Symmetry: C3
Subunit: 138 residues, 3 copies
């Protein structure tokens, strides 16, 4: 179902000029993360830039995590993806939420302030507990 996530706004544009992350529709899996830039950023082929989303989140439950993923169309069509490929957010992380924006493509691409550059999916996770064995059972 649903999960309450605390949000701290670090850039005053968020909620104003740049909407807070939101599900585009009722059936969307991911919330859109936007580039909180002071000017357009032209990201060169194979360049990585660390971009602020203008917020911090705190998931607050040990069996919840979030992953930052590329946008499907932008990642395919323009190669704007993530330098760390999938950004995993721990339930106890409280820092600024940053996107490692990597242009894997062969052409430069300009991201304007407020443009959607990734998405955030909140998901349930399990906590593994190991048992060391000599041979696996079952």
């Amino acid at each position: 179902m649903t999960h309450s996530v605390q949000l701290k706004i670090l850039d005053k544009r968020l909620g104003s000029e740049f909407p807070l992350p939101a599900y585009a529709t009722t059936g969307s899996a991911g919330l859109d993360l936007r580039a909180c830039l002071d000017e357009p950023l032209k990201i060169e082929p194979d360049e990585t830039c660390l971009i602020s989303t203008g917020l911090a989140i705190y998931l607050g439950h040990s069996n919840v995590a979030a992953t930052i993923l590329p946008r499907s169309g932008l990642g395919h069509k323009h190669g704007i993806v993530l330098g760390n490929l999938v950004g995993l957010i721990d339930s106890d992380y409280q820092g600024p939420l940053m996107v490692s924006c990597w242009n894997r493509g062969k052409e430069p691409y300009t991201i304007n302030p407020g443009d959607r550059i990734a998405q955030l999916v909140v998901l349930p996770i399990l906590k593994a507990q190991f048992a060391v064995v000599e041979e696996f059972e079952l």
Copy 2:
């Protein structure tokens, strides 16, 4: 447990010459997605090609999503991975299911029609509801 997913077949080879996506075993996490090509495709180093799977899916439940991921061995050994890195499918998406096939490797690779080029994992997701705070609690 299980989840019913509606499937629309867009290429008549699916279910015939090219098996529908299936779990290889009872313990497989992912269903294999195959390249619905009219001829072999030689994908050059660093090239991305959008490839049809010959179907459309509709997950139909707001707390279910699917991710398209590279094959482990093909992605490691040959660099055949995804141009958008992880393709997230929303519960309300109804369009053709396409794979952004990116050859990150240094050698060209030939994909034959019907070859497995990615896998699809169906998973539960949470719907985040934000609360804006000045300082995080707990």
Copy 3:
């Protein structure tokens, strides 16, 4: 909640010189996977190396999977990520757990034996059951 995972130690350094994978904190989503190398490995720009974690796991439940993901900071700052982008581990897989370490960066990077090179997230998955339809309902 939690999930028991059987672990087979293949390199005697594991648990000794190199800690077993563990959650760094109570709120960590991922367990750290370490490089079980016999000497430091200098991974060239765009090179992929298959690196042993010195173990094998067996998740053992059909609705559990695990994904190997890059480290967030190492993947962003140094481009040390995964050749297959996300390594999905099936519930019935029993083989050595290996990391496809890809340096997507422009500079070489040296990984020392025992260094953390990826993380492993254990998560619930659904088993899809298709129904072929001519038109989607609902």
